Ligand binder design. Structure first.
Ligand SMILES: [Ca+2]
Ligand SMILES: [Ca+2]
Ligand SMILES: [Ca+2]
Ligand SMILES: [Ca+2]
Lengths: 243, 257
């Protein structure tokens, strides 16, 4: 795809979220850069409305998968870059087990030289002393697989995965994501074979930032797809030769 | 001048078998060659001149071979160079044939047998003495570590074996139709006998080509070792052969034939 060449090197990123969770309104602004050749993201977010009424870790998946590394042999499966620069719509429902849910709508696109992710989020049915509104999540993040299937009728992809959020009493809070992506433009896109993205992320704080904020580093690579026959041959050859 | 002496001279300019030399190597080639025939400083410039002329009047190995070698020693260096072996299966049928003791290496005595049959095949009677001399020259030319036997790759160079057939296939040809097309191309290539299963030398050739994707050229003993391992991996009915359906399933083919 032509969209792929937009991500050659280092690309600046902006993020805006307007949120409402059980009536608590908040806004988040993010900035940073993406380096898709290394599956590399570096992002800082700040709550601009004061304190955030939900844990930062609950907002990580909501707050730019066009930055995933796609190995050369899986390039024909990279939907996210193919919709660029006109971008795509990313819609989700995130069901937190034994608690409420997020409903999000984002447009991800280039605005001049910058990849911009604009989100609106609504949260309902949260228990006022549950893990989210009680702030009982640990400030950290686990590694996941994000499963991607083509949705030919919608000219897009359907995406499903579960995130695991550590609780401070030692338990885990599951969040079950139902995701759809749709191109904004009329241009051609790449519909993938079934695969997944493998993610890893670390959370930190900027010591010189007085506002409620999160620093996020993430690595993301695609996998799971059949390569050419030579791929199977090469990997079998490797194993036959051990010992 | 024997093939080995010509070969040693050819080595200075074409050590990795491009098959040719270049036009300002040429003079240094004749020089060095002419030096090799034990030639006097007094006759050098003329012989060089005449030689250059003859050639000009007639830069690949065949051309320099015809000038300085007998027709039997040209044959030794070029019998396959004009007719390179296209199939690794045929190659391993030859290997198995001449490695009659299954030692994993072609000894001097096995090379002599190879050459005896070779000459008879091209309807050429040579004396027993030249048979011996040629075996020694061929050995000297192709015995890389001078240990006195020929390895798998050494016979491959003697037969001018073409590139590994498997190397044409690419990672990004990942569609189901792409993988099916390439799988069929592969199995057509190895199943020379058209039986629907790889047997004997068809397995051999496949094992050689598969392992050499990820390892330096393999030895005769390693081949037999990897053949067993591959069979223990993919031989579902345990009949010592690789049915198409077994190779397909072991290479991830979506629809089993
Ligand atoms: Ca032997
Ligand atoms: Ca040797
Ligand atoms: Ca067969
Ligand atoms: Ca079998």
């Amino acid at each position: 795809s032509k969209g792929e060449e937009l991500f050659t090197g280092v690309v600046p990123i902006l993020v805006e979220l307007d949120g409402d969770v059980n009536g608590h309104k908040f806004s988040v602004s993010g900035e940073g850069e993406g380096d898709a050749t290394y599956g590399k993201l570096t992002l800082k977010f700040i709550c601009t409305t004061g304190k955030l009424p939900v844990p930062w870790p609950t907002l990580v998946t909501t707050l730019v998968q066009c930055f995933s590394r796609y190995p050369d042999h899986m390039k024909r499966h990279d939907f996210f870059k193919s919709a660029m620069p006109e971008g795509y719509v990313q819609e989700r429902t995130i069901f937190f087990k034994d608690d409420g849910n997020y409903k999000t709508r984002a447009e991800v696109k280039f605005e001049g030289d910058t990849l911009v992710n604009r989100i609106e989020l609504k949260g309902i049915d949260f228990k006022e002393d549950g893990n989210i509104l009680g702030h009982k999540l640990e400030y950290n993040y686990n590694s996941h697989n994000v499963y991607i299937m083509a949705d030919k009728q919608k000219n897009g992809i359907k995406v499903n995965f579960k995130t695991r959020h550590n609780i401070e009493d030692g338990s885990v809070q599951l969040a079950d994501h139902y995701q759809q992506n749709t191109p904004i433009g009329d241009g051609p896109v790449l519909l993938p074979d079934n695969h997944y993205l493998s993610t890893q992320s670390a959370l930190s704080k900027d010591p010189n930032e007085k506002r409620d904020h999160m620093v996020l580093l993430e690595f993301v690579t695609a996998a799971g797809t059949m390569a050419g026959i030579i791929g199977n041959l090469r990997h079998m050859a490797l194993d036959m030769g051990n010992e | 001048l024997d093939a080995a002496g010509f070969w040693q001279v050819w080595q200075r300019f074409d050590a990795d078998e491009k098959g040719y030399i270049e036009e300002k190597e040429l003079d240094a080639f004749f020089l060095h060659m002419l030096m090799k025939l034990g030639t006097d400083d007094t006759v050098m410039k003329a012989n060089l001149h005449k030689v250059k002329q003859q050639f000009m009047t007639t830069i690949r190995m065949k051309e320099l071979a015809g000038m300085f070698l007998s027709e039997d020693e040209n044959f030794l260096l070029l019998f396959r160079r004009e007719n390179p072996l296209d199939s690794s299966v045929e190659f391993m049928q030859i290997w198995r044939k001449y490695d009659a003791d299954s030692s994993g290496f072609i000894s001097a005595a096995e090379l002599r047998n190879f050459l005896r049959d070779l000459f008879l095949h091209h309807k050429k009677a040579i004396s027993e003495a030249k048979l011996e001399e040629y075996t020694g020259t061929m050995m000297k030319i192709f015995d890389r570590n001078k240990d006195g036997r020929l390895d798998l790759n050494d016979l491959a160079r003697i037969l001018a074996l073409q590139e590994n057939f498997l190397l044409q296939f690419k990672m990004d040809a990942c569609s189901t139709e792409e993988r099916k097309r390439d799988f069929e191309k592969i199995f057509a290539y190895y199943d020379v006998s058209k039986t629907g299963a790889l047997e004997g030398p068809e397995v051999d050739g496949f094992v050689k080509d598969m392992m050499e994707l990820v390892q330096p050229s393999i030895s005769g003993v390693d081949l037999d070792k990897f053949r067993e391992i591959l069979l223990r991996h993919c031989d579902v009915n345990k009949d010592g052969k690789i049915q198409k359906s077994e190779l397909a399933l072991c290479l991830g083919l979506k629809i089993n034939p």
